[PDB]
Curated annotation (Swiss-Prot):
Function: Basic protein that bind to cell membrane and depolarizes cardiomyocytes. This cytotoxin also shows lytic activities, but 2-fold more important than that of CTX-A2. It binds to the integrin alpha-V/beta-3 with a moderate affinity. Inhibits protein kinase C. It may interact with sulfatides in the cell membrane, which induces pore formation and cell internalization and is responsible for cytotoxicity in cardiomyocytes. It may also target the mitochondrial membrane and induces mitochondrial swelling and fragmentation.
Protein name as it appears in the record: Cytotoxin 4
Protein localization: Secreted; Target cell membrane
Binding partners and assembly: Monomer in solution; Homodimer and oligomer in the presence of negatively charged lipids forming a pore with a size ranging between 20 and 30 Angstroms.
Molecular function as annotated in GO: protein kinase inhibitor activity; toxin activity
Key words of the record: Cardiotoxin, Cytolysis, Disulfide bond, Hemolysis, Membrane, Protein kinase inhibitor, Secreted, Signal, Target cell membrane, Target membrane, Toxin
Part of the whole protein covered: 22 to 81 of 81
Record-stated family: Belongs to the three-finger toxin family. Short-chain subfamily. Type IA cytotoxin sub-subfamily.
Cystine connections: 3-21, 14-38, 42-53, 54-59
Gene Ontology biological process terms in this record: killing of cells of another organism
One GO location term (cellular component): extracellular region
UniProt note on tissues of expression: Expressed by the venom gland.
Length: 60
């Protein structure tokens, strides 16, 4: 599939060279929403950016 979410109101598709989608967010900030893209592997997440990878409807 694709990522019917990125940010609050953004939605996208992926092509067929990627597996999941993750929203890249941040921890120092005032929000929680920031972005998303696709992914090939979800390892871990840093203490700088919120990798909320997922493989559901909003991912693949």
């Amino acid at each position: 599939r694709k990522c019917n979410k990125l940010v609050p109101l953004f939605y996208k598709t992926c092509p067929a060279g990627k597996n999941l989608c993750y929203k890249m967010f941040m921890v120092s900030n005032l929000t929680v929403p920031v972005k998303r893209g696709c992914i090939d592997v979800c390892p871990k997440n840093s203490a700088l950016v919120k990798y909320v990878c997922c493989n559901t409807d909003r991912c693949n």
